[PDB]
Each structure stands twice: as C-alpha cells, then as structure tokens.
Amino acid sequence: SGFRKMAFPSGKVEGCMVQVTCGTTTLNGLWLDDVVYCPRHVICNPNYEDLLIRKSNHNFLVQAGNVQLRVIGHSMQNCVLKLKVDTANPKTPKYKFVRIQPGQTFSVLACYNGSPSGVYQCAMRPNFTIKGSFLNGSCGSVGFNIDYDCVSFCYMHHMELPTGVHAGTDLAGNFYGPFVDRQTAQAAGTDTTITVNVLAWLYAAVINGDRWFLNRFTTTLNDFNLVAMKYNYEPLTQDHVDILGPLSAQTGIAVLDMCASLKELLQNGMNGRTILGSALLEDEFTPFDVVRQCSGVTFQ
Amino acid sequence: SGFRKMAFPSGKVEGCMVQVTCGTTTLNGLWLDDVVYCPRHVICNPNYEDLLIRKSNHNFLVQAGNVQLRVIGHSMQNCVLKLKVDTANPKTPKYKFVRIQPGQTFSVLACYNGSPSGVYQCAMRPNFTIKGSFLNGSCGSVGFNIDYDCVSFCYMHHMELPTGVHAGTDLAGNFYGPFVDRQTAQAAGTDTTITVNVLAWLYAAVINGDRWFLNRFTTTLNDFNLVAMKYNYEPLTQDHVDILGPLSAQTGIAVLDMCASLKELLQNGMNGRTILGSALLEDEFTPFDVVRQCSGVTFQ
Numbered sequence: 001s002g003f004r005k006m007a008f009p010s011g012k013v014e015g016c017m018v019q020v021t022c023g024t025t026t027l028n029g030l031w032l033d034d035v036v037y038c039p040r041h042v043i044c045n046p047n048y049e050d051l052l053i054r055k056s057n058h059n060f061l062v063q064a065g066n067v068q069l070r071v072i073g074h075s076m077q078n079c080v081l082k083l084k085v086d087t088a089n090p091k092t093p094k095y096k097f098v099r100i101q102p103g104q105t106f107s108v109l110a111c112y113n114g115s116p117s118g119v120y121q122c123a124m125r126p127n128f129t130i131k132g133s134f135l136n137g138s139c140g141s142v143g144f145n146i147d148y149d150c151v152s153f154c155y156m157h158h159m160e161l162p163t164g165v166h167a168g169t170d171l172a173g174n175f176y177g178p179f180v181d182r183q184t185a186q187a188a189g190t191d192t193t194i195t196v197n198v199l200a201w202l203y204a205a206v207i208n209g210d211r212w213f214l215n216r217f218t219t220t221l222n223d224f225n226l227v228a229m230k231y232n233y234e235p236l237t238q239d240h241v242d243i244l245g246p247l248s249a250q251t252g253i254a255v256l257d258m259c260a261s262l263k264e265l266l267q268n269g270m271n272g273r274t275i276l277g278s279a280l281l282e283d284e285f286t287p288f289d290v291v292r293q294c295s296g297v298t299f300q
Numbered sequence: 301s302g303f304r305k306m307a308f309p310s311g312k313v314e315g316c317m318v319q320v321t322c323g324t325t326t327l328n329g330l331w332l333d334d335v336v337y338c339p340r341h342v343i344c345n346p347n348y349e350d351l352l353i354r355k356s357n358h359n360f361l362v363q364a365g366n367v368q369l370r371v372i373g374h375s376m377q378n379c380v381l382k383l384k385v386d387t388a389n390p391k392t393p394k395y396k397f398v399r400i401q402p403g404q405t406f407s408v409l410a411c412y413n414g415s416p417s418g419v420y421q422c423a424m425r426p427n428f429t430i431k432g433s434f435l436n437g438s439c440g441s442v443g444f445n446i447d448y449d450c451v452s453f454c455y456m457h458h459m460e461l462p463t464g465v466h467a468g469t470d471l472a473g474n475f476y477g478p479f480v481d482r483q484t485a486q487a488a489g490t491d492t493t494i495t496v497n498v499l500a501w502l503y504a505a506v507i508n509g510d511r512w513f514l515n516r517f518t519t520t521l522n523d524f525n526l527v528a529m530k531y532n533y534e535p536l537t538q539d540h541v542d543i544l545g546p547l548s549a550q551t552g553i554a555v556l557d558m559c560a561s562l563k564e565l566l567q568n569g570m571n572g573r574t575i576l577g578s579a580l581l582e583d584e585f586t587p588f589d590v591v592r593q594c595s596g597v598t599f600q
C-alpha cells in the first residue's frame with residue numbers, strides 16, 4: 001500500500017536525449033531513429049520560415065554524450081525542428097507521438113545540455129499549461145507515458161509564462177493551448193480543477209484505508225456539477241463516470257456517492273485533516289494512474 | 301522556475317533489476333557485476349541461517365528479462381542474500397552502497413517481477429520508516445541517489461508496517477530502524493517532522509517567488525527549538541544551520557530569520573494559503589535537493 005505521485009521509469013527516454021546547439025542557443029533534442037526533434041526557437045516577432053531558409057546543416061551542432069552527430073537535412077513541422085542525422089539512435093525505443101487531452105498526466109524528464117536532471121509527474125491543466133520545474137536550458141525536455149513497452153511522447157517544453165507555469169507542444173510541434181513561440185503578451189487563462197482526477201484520487205484514498213471523508217449521501221450528476229462550477233471544478237460528464245467504473249467496482253462506492261463526498265469536502269473543507277498526506281484535493285492522478293499504482297502494472 | 305518532487309532518472313537502475321524466484325516466492329533483485337542482491341526472506345520466527353544451509357544454488361531462479369541467470373554461489377549478509385551468478389551485468393553502472401541518515405531523501409524504483417513500474421522520491425523518516433508505494437511483489441526494489449555518474453544505492457524494500465509505511469535495509473542488509481524480517485509485533489515509532497528539510501523547502505518557495513510567509517522577525521536557535529518540540533519537529537542543530545547557508549546566501553534570508561517564519565507558520569497555520577502548491581509544510585526536500593532543482597544540476 002501507499003500512494004505516491006509516481007513517474008514512469010525514464011530509461012527509455014534518457015537513451016534519446018541529445019544536446020542541440022545553434023549559434024548562441026543550446027537546448028535539448030529528442031533523437032529517435034535518424035531524426036532529432038527540438039524546439040524551432042533554437043534557430044538564429046520572428047519569422048521562423050525566413051530564419052530557417054537562412055541556416056545551413058553545419059550550423060546545427062548535435063551532441064549525443066561525447067559523440068557529435070552530423071546533420072544531413074532539416075525541416076520544420078509547426079513549432080518543432082526535425083534535424084535529419086546520419087546515424088540512427090541504437091537506443092530508439094518503441095514509440096508513438098500522441099497529442100493528449102487536458103486532464104491527462106505524463107512524466108517529464110527534465111534535461112539540461114542533453115543530460116537528464118530529474119523525472120517527475122505532471123498533468124496537462126485544463127488551461128493547457130503544465131506546472132513543471134524548468135530552468136533555462138530545459139527546452140526540448142519531453143513528457144511521456146509508457147504503455148507496456150511503448151513510449152508515447154506527448155510534450156516537448158518550449159517556454160515559461162509569467163505566472164511560473166509552462167507551455168509547450170506535442171512532438172509534432174503543435175502548442176497545447178493558445179500559446180505561440182513569440183516573446184509577445186500571453187496569459188495562461190483561468191485554470192480549473194480536474195474533477196474526474198480528484199474523484200480518482202479519493203478512490204485511491206479508500207483503496208489505501210482513508211475513509212474519513214465518505215458520507216452516507218448521494219447526488220445526481222446535475223446537482224454535483226452545480227456545486228462543481230461554484231468551486232471552479234471541471235464539469236463531470238457521464239463519460240467520466242463510466243471511466244471511474246472500475247474504481248467504483250473495486251471499492252464498492254458508487255461514482256455518484258463519491259461525488260457526494262467530494263461535494264461535502266468542497267463545502268466544508270478538510271477541517272484539519274489530510275487525505276493521502278495532502279491537505280488539498282489532488283487532481284493530477286487520472287483514473288488509470290490510480291489503477292496502475294494500486295494494482296501494480298509494470299512496463300518493459 | 302517551478303518546484304516539483306523530483307526523482308533521479310532511473311535508467312541506470314532499471315538496467316540492474318532482475319526477478320528472483322525461490323520455491324513459491326518471487327521478488328526483485330539487484331544485479332551488479334556478477335552478484336544479485338535480494339531480501340533474504342525469498343528463501344523457503346524463522347532461522348535464516350538454517351533455512352539457507354538447506355537450499356541449493358539451483359533452487360534460485362534468477363530471470364533478467366528473457367535470459368535466465370545461473371547461480372553459482374550464495375551467501376547471506378545480514379538480511380540480504382547475495383547470489384553469485386556466472387554472468388556480470390554489462391549494464392552495471394558506477395555505484396556505491398551507502399547507509400543514509402534519517403532526513404535524507406532518495407528515489408525509489410518500484411518493481412514487480414523484475415520489471416520497473418514507477419519512480420518516486422522518498423525520505424527516510426526520523427523513525428526509520430519510509431512512506432512508499434509498495435504492493436506485494438515489490439520486495440527487492442531499491443532506493444538510490446545519483447551523484448554525477450555514480451549510483452549510490454541506499455535502500456532495499458522488505459516489508460510493510462501495519463500503519464501502511466514501509467521498512468527495509470541498506471544494500472548490506474542492515475535494517476533501517478529497529479525492524480526485523482520476522483512476522484512479529486513491530487510498530488514504527490512516533491514520527492517527527494524533518495525541520496531542516498522544511499526550512500530548505502521554504503527557501504525553495506522564496507527562490508520561486510512565494511514570499512507571503514516571511515516576516516520581519518528573527519529567533520535564536522534555542523527559542524526556535526523550544527517551538528519545534530511542541531509541534532513534533534526534529535531539533536535544528538547548528539550543523540543544520542550551516543547546511544542551509546548557501547540557500548540563505550542566495551535568497552538573502554538569514555537562516556534564523558527563516559526559522560522565525562517557520563515558527564509563525566507553526567503557530568498560526570497557513571490560513572487558507574499554499575506554499576509551492578502544498579497546504580502542508582513539506583519535509584521531504586533536503587537542502588541539497590533544493591539546490592539541485594533550483595540551479596539545474598544534471599547527471600550522466
């Protein structure tokens with residue numbers, strides 16, 4: 001037992017991190033087969049199409065540890081640069097590029113100068129920011145999930161917003177949210193709490209012996225959502241309820257009953273108590289995160 | 301910016317995890333050079349010396365993925381079993397075995413059937429338990445730190461206490477705390493909060509723009525420790541103050557002034573507010589964790 005904010009093992013991704021230097025900019029790239037993916041802002045209101053037509057392959061210095069990689073072609077796809085290199089990464093895992101939905105969680109392998117610094121778990125917020133931990137040099141660090149043996153890359157880091165939160169793209173270079181890779185006025189947008197994730201985490205708490213927040217009451221989806229809005233929670237849909245089905249089945253607590261418990265927590269606060277060692281309602285565990293950590297699924 | 305509970309990249313350790321099966325018990329082992337380390341309770345008020353004299357090398361089935369490892373010798377060192385195998389692990393990193401002090405943090409690579417499931421950050425509690433996330437089959441999972449290129453193994457998982465917390469050994473098989481690998485009555489002991497870590501995390505908060513908890517006041521080490529005891533905090537020593545020196549220097553906040561701020565937080569609570577996204581005072585970041593995450597140190 002126990003419940004921790006758990007990241008995927010990062011080895012498959014560590015084997016793909018490289019350093020990309022162009023002019024005065026150094027950042028990280030993702031080396032998969034014979035392509036290195038990095039943020040297009042590594043090139044020297046900028047017009048990146050113009051900037052890129054003016055660069056040569058030899059302007060890109062790609063370093064994989066102490067082995068320099070020669071670029072033999074380059075292209076831009078949305079806000080990512082794809083550097084064709086003459087060597088396929090022998091450590092390339094099985095992988096997919098996925099564009100995730102807000103509320104979905106992923107692991108971030110924070111990197112500097114192509115070298116992994118740390119791994120941690122994030123959620124894509126409803127306002128399409130992530131609350132990451134990123135210092136200068138971390139651009140090109142990627143977020144990912146692992147499904148059995150396959151790495152699903154879902155995030156590459158590009159920039160920090162003035163509120164200290166972070167914005168980036170999928171691995172095809174499309175930003176999450178309305179952000180652009182320009183030094184222009186941009187604000188994150190009002191965030192909301194991921195309701196289906198809070199409920200999942202309450203089920204995690206029950207599976208682990210926390211029960212103090214339960215009540216004998218129930219609610220309709222409609223009356224719950226009426227309370228959710230006042231507290232800046234995302235609407236809970238029937239699809240969310242369906243997703244919460246297995247956790248409901250394992251614990252014997254109807255989804256709508258756990259909603260009634262969340263309602264009472266929202267209205268009365270936690271009154272000096274903790275749930276899974278938190279004094280806040282935690283929303284960066286999906287239902288599938290809870291099932292993975294509470295049943296013991298492995299990867300390889 | 302941002303501050304996250306960050307684990308070390310786990311790739312160097314993933315390359316060392318194996319499955320050890322003996323009789324009806326399957327658990328994880330750590331394969332370094334030609335030795336596999338696992339908990340001595342994998343062997344069939346038990347007297348392990350007797351139990352082990354009665355086992356043969358061929359009773360130990362060691363699986364490294366889809367390659368079976370043949371045991372050519374075995375010995376017991378305290379509560380760990382060392383299985384000599386005929387093949388040195390080619391993925392063996394630079395490594396050390398270290399016995400950590402309470403208050404020190406480490407990353408845990410949770411494993412089942414030799415296969416990594418997830419990575420998360422832990423502290424050794426003052427009562428020598430860890431608040432981990434461990435299901436049946438996770439024994440032999442290890443905790444570790446990485447210093448540049450070297451993996452310092454500090455923990456191997458053995459058992460769960462009735463309060464849902466966890467106990468284990470160093471990699472030489474000595475338990476942390478008074479625990480024994482017997483199914484006998486054992487209780488964790490009253491825990492306390494790691495004071496020097498809370499102060500480090502408050503400095504992390506300042507480095508990241510949280511300042512609301514600061515005050516114009518100061519305190520002596522003696523008067524602070526008087527308040528610390530009432531709230532079940534570990535005594536803060538001058539050595540702790542010295543360790544907090546760099547963070548004090550970077551932020552311009554004397555250690556004793558940050559103590560006065562912690563005093564006021566202990567006495568008034570946080571009153572509806574959060575620090576680094578927590579509504580509790582967080583104590584599983586060491587001073588060195590804060591400096592690593594707020595300056596960008598990498599590993600390789």
Ligand SMILES: *[C@](O)(C(N)=O)[C@H](C[C@@H]1CCNC1=O)NC(=O)[C@@H]1[C@@H]2[C@H](CN1C(=O)[C@@H](NC(=O)NC(C)(C)C)C(C)(C)C)C2(C)C
Pocket residue numbers: 026027041134135136137138139140158159160161162166180181182183184185186187301
């Ligand atoms: C990245 O390029 C790298 N080399 O690591 C860097 C990562 C940043 C640095 C601090 N924390 C991070 O996550 N990204 C950038 O420097 C991007 C890059 C240029 C500006 N930029 C920023 O993140 C800036 N933010 C910013 O300008 N925000 C606005 C005003 C657009 C809302 C800044 C000030 C450097 C943090 C581009 C092309 C956006």
Ligand SMILES: *[C@](O)(C(N)=O)[C@H](C[C@@H]1CCNC1=O)NC(=O)[C@@H]1[C@@H]2[C@H](CN1C(=O)[C@@H](NC(=O)NC(C)(C)C)C(C)(C)C)C2(C)C
Pocket residue numbers: 001326327341434435436437438439440458459460461462466480481482483484485486487
């Ligand atoms: C480990 O052997 C494995 N195969 O993974 C297992 C890990 C446990 C299982 C559930 N969560 C864990 O961390 N460890 C054990 O089974 C150890 C082993 C035998 C009992 N044991 C326990 O952890 C038990 N706890 C326990 O007996 N606690 C006392 C009463 C001593 C305080 C239990 C009940 C299985 C959780 C030994 C030799 C201690």
